[PDB]
Amino acid sequence: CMEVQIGAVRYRRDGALLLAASSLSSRTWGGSIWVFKDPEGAPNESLCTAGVQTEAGVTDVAWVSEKGILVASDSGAVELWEILEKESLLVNKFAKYEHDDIVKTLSVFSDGTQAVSGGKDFSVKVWDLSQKAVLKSYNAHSSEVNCVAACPGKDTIFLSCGEDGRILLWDTRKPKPATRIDFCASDTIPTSVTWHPEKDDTFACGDETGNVSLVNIKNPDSAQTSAVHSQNITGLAYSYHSSPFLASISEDCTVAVLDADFSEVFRDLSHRDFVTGVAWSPLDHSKFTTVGWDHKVLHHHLP
Amino acid sequence: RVSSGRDVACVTEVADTLGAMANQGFDFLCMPIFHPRFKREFYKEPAKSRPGPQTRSDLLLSGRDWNTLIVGKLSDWIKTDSEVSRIRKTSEAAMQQELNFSAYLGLPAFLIPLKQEDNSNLSRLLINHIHVGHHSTMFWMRVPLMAPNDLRDDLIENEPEERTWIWWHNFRSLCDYNKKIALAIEIGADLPSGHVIDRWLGEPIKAAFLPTSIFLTNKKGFPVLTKVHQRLIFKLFKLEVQFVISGSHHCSYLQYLEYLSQNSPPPGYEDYLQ
Amino acid sequence: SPLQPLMDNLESQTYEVFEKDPVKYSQYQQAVYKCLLDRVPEEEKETNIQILMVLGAGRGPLVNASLRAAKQAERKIKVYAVEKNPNAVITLEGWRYEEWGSQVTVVSGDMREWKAPEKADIIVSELLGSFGDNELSPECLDGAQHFLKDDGVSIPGEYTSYLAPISSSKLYNEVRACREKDRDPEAQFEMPYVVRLHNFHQLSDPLPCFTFHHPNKDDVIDNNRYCCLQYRVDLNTVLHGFAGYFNTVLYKDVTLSICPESHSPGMFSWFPILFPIKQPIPMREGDTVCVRFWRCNNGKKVWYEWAVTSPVCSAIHNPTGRSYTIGL
Amino acid sequence: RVSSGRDVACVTEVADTLGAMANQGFDFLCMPIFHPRFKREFYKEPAKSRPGPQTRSDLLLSGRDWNTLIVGKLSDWIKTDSEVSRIRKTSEAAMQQELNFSAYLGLPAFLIPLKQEDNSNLSRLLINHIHVGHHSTMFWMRVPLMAPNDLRDDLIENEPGEERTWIWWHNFRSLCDYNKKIALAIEIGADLPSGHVIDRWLGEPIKAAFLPTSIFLTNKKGFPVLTKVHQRLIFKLFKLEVQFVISGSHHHSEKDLCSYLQYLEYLSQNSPPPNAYEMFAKGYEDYLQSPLQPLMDNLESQTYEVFEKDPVKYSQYQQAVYKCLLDRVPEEEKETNIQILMVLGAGRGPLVNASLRAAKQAERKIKVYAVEKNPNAVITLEGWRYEEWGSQVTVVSGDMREWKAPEKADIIVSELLGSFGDNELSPECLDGAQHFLKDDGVSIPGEYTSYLAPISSSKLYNEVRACREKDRDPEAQFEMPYVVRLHNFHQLSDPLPCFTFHHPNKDDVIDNNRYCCLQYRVDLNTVLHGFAGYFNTVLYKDVTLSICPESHSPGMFSWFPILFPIKQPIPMREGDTVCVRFWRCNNGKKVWYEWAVTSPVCSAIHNPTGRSYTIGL
Ligand SMILES: Nc1ncnc2c1ncn2[C@@H]1O[C@H](CSCC[C@H](N)C(=O)O)[C@@H](O)[C@H]1O
Ligand SMILES: Nc1ncnc2c1ncn2[C@@H]1O[C@H](CSCC[C@H](N)C(=O)O)[C@@H](O)[C@H]1O
């Protein structure tokens, strides 16, 4: 069956739900990947369409194109799984153990042929999914890499944040790709970053304190910060609206949603443990799904 | 005759991993007793009331195994000197929890990494744990010879040796040079000067960590260290310290260590004090 | 060594010393005076009876200072005089059945365990030590907070301890001679002493250490504290330890303080406290002095742990309260 | 393997004698470093100015050989306790000469025989030599089990009790203040004393046993054979792992010296199998530790493993739950009645499993609550919970005194018993857990009682006396209980019931402060060193556990006894009475014991106000 601690949740461009779970308390610390074409069936393994167990725990998962699935494992490996749809089967294509420590995060570029990895070994690796090998490995962070986010529409630019307190803007063309972004109260440790879909040079970030910040790379003095949560932000996600809402999850077991003006609109206290995932529905633009370590897969709606 | 251990980030199966590293030629295993991602709340509901086990029980291995084969590793998410009050509190609870569990298992050694200069609260909690009953547990302090920020690549356009020594010295001084507190140095791609090296060797080093990434690939696809690294291994040999291999397999690096021994340069009242 | 009125029952002679300062009596009487006028208007001059509780009544003084403050403000109060010291209760029931009357109810027991049959508007206590919280005032009031009304006022409302790096070869050698048999020969350096100002030379202005406010409306009440205080040295001297002072706010604007350059009354109400050091540190000018200070509470004991990390890194003094603790 | 040595009267060539005895099977040689006839003068000419070496050089053997192969022998003409001043003064100078030279050689052991009761001046010279820096040399005191005058043949017309030589050793060791460097080397004669006398000898630090060649009988084949009486003594010496020494000429048999060593090896591989022993082996024989406090401290996994090694405690508790269930729910309520059972102090499991299997054996349904305060043990408890047990067992982490049960229990099962019964604060723990027990609830155990008995043990006393730690009261060691073993002391009288605790306590005002005066009559002339503590308990009706001396109830190997030492040992005559005042105190923060002796001699109250020993909460 599926492990207790659910790690991540990703939506596919048809409604398919992609959840990752890992065992963090039992005698066997493994993991498993699941694909639900019927999101309401989650987390029941009897109502899934495809499921497979990984060699170790899974920290993060991401959709590759439509059939491919990327996996960040405890073994320090990045795994690409393909969905043999209606064979009820998930087949691994490659697993490359490039990181020397747990891969904490990974993001896929828009073209769906490249990806970036964030490791506990301080390493940031850009991947060539087609050739089943890495391109360049970056050691810019002096501590654990928390989150990485590929810039939508730009296959050479991505963001990264780590325990070293750095938020790095990347460009794999320059000899010095990394550029540290600073703003008011950036002294904290950033735990999650994400790009704004409708604004240029703008991203949203969260720290281990509970703050969710809106930062424009150009003119960072107008950065909007808000004490949304009381503990570490564990994920950020924008909606599919023209003026997208910002969903935030944290270790305070709460899920909140801000608008364009950074005012609170939604807040759910239904989770009974660390909510560790959040994703908006491509079908219903008011619907978004969150997962936690309470083995709950909850769906929400905007007022 | 080169006693070596294996450093792992996470163990999916204890019984299987032990036999696997035994076939490779490792003597002991550096593993976390709690899952490195399994963070936990101690004060705030509902995460505080989390059901189920906190970690895998002691009945997975025999008492003999815990006392000879396992070196515990402290969770990295624990930051007892965090400027955030809430985080400092949680870490203090987690620190005591894992220190108590390591002593419960009867572990011979427990890894506690130093990642900064300020480890005041850590030392306070550690010497407290030592003073309150629990005993017979050596405490290996993972301290890199060079700071992680001094070993990173110059890739930040807006942000272009004695440092880590202060980390160890201040912590040991704060701990009043406790006998149960030893040193576990980690070797980077760049080494400090010869004098600094000798100063580190004066400290009670019980283990030397060798990252798999500092090894160069030879003509025949074999691991090899530079002469600079080699001379350090030669000095570590005459201290009879243990070597821990960390990092990814991409695993018989011990062959090169034995190779450096069999063919090591020639030369015990050294501690003697009466 | 600092007296512990909680772990120990004070003698009558000891109480007589504490009751010799008219300043503490006046300021507390003034505090009750102002507090009454602020929580009951003139049109409720007789239809409103304020429930006042003197937590730690001692031999009387705080109860009488509250009664006279009620007459001065022309307000009616129902007094509860609670005390754990059985010997002091005997004195309390002397005033009770000769002077006070049925308006004052004398209670014998701990305020943390006592079950009040009536919530209080005002709680008045004087559990302050030379370092403010060294007599465990927070723990006592926290366990007595439940029977305080939702809009209740606590006197004192808050207090804060202070630390300052000092130099005193005189005080150090006096502590060094405090080696007792059948214990740690260095234990004397790991415990606070009640000293005098003229016996030491302060090296820098005191910084705020720990602050406690009542009633504590925190989520999870914790009295475990930690702070790093840094001071710059302007002379070539030797660090021998740290002086401890405190200031407190009884009611609004009515305060008491033993801080060096304080303009608030109470400068003669308490002797300062001293946290010695094992290895004295000779320092130059321009040097900085960072001290790590801990206040620990394991449920059974309360103590302090301190360490110097600048200019020279010393060792943590009194680890796990091995040399000095405070009862309950 | 049996290590043995050869006692020679004299040695001509040392190198020859070594290799000779080495091929005989010996491991070391007992030889004199000075010639046994080389009597010398010190204070009077012309004999004072004797030229030449005093004895052979040290360069004959290497340091390795001197340190491991040679045991020195003191000259027999040296009599430092002679009533003649000239002889004594000469012997004193001779005594110091051979002692300083034996230490110079780095000898591992040195032989000094005791031939009389008065060895006062011998003691003074010996403990001096130990105190003037020269140490690391064990001193084997050769004392025969029987006096030479008691083993001689009755061949005198005008000149025709066995503890005689015991006084020789006891007085000597006492004068030497029980020094660590002084050991015993018994010499076995043809006649042996009582078995109890032998058992007292074996209690002493025996390092060697001398086997004369004249005690061996010649078999009909010509081989050296010991009598059955001596064989039993050798068997007792085997488990003490002492070394044997053969003294005398091998020409009493038709074979050589090697045959004597083969016979001992023969007895070793044919020695009886040990039981009623081996519990403690190998060993808790000299066990002198402080009682564990599972309440104030969190036990280690290794520690739990030791407690869970006794099948008796598991069986009796399983039997207790078995009988208790059948007695409180009939056969017609075989499935309509669910008994609420709570394991208070579940540890790592055992008590929970013993309750589950007792439910299946009795065919009764139970709802189990497994509570524990040790967070580390709870981790183990939740392993069984989510793999074996299921939802029928609810694991609770916390103190039973503070835990708020959402459901009252029919049966509470706990094992908080110490060596003295209540020394692990079982009453206090159960009293605070009594409220969530039903009005007709059953507690396991239902009751327990501690016992005290006056004992005599110079061995245990001196072990406690050496437990003086720095930075505390130099006499604090005498004011605290120790977990010891039975064979290390001699009980002087039958144990009396001390304190009794029953659960649930239905008293008006529950008080665990206890006081009693226990009196015992002495039937021997001995020395009071302290009091042994035992306990017995009743889990359920008729199902009991006990560590009392002459108890027929199981559990005799489940706990070591406890010892309450005394500061001033009391020498007593027979007919004397021993009244001991014993207190159990509880000030709300600590629990401790206070004891005092008021007969025959009035001592002082030990551990007053728990100044030396307390128990947490
Ligand atoms: N928990 C508690 N319950 C009841 N009374 C208490 C208490 N703690 C302290 N007290 C009482 O309060 C009084 C404090 S007297 C304090 C004197 C003050 N520190 C000074 O130096 O001037 C004592 O008489 C004591 O008996
Ligand atoms: N007040 C309390 N609350 C909860 N558990 C307790 C407790 N007091 C003791 N325990 C638990 O009960 C267990 C007692 S183990 C006792 C072993 C026994 N004396 C023997 O020698 O064989 C311990 O694991 C301890 O954690």
Numbering used by the authors:
A (entry chain D): 16 to 318
B (entry chain C): 8 to 167, 178 to 267, 274 to 290, 299 to 305
C (entry chain A): 306 to 633
D (entry chain A): 8 to 167, 177 to 633
Sentences copied from the publication:
PRMT5 is a Type II enzyme, capable of mono- and symmetric dimethylation. PRMT5 methylates histones H2A and H4 on Arg3, histone H3 on Arg2 and Arg8, and many other proteins.
Here we report the structure of the full-length X. laevis PRMT5-MEP50 complex crystallized in the presence of S-adenosylhomocysteine (SAH), the byproduct of the methylation reaction. The 3.0 Å structure revealed that PRMT5 forms a tetramer (a dimer of dimers with D2 symmetry). The two PRMT5 molecules in the asymmetric unit form a previously uncharacterized interface which results in the observed tetrameric assembly. MEP50 is not directly involved in the PRMT5 oligomeric interactions. PRMT5 residues R57 and R63 interact with MEP50 F289 and W44, respectively, by cation-pi interactions and are conserved among vertebrates. The prominent electron density assigned to the SAH sulfur in the Xenopus structure allows for confident placement adjacent to a small channel that connects the PRMT5 catalytic site with bulk solvent. This model suggests that the methyl donor on SAM would also be facing solvent and therefore this channel could support the entry of the substrate arginine guanidinium group into the catalytic site. In the Xenopus PRMT5-MEP50 structure we observed that these invariant glutamic acid residues (Glu431 and Glu440) are hydrogen bonded to SAH, in contrast to the C. elegans and human structures.
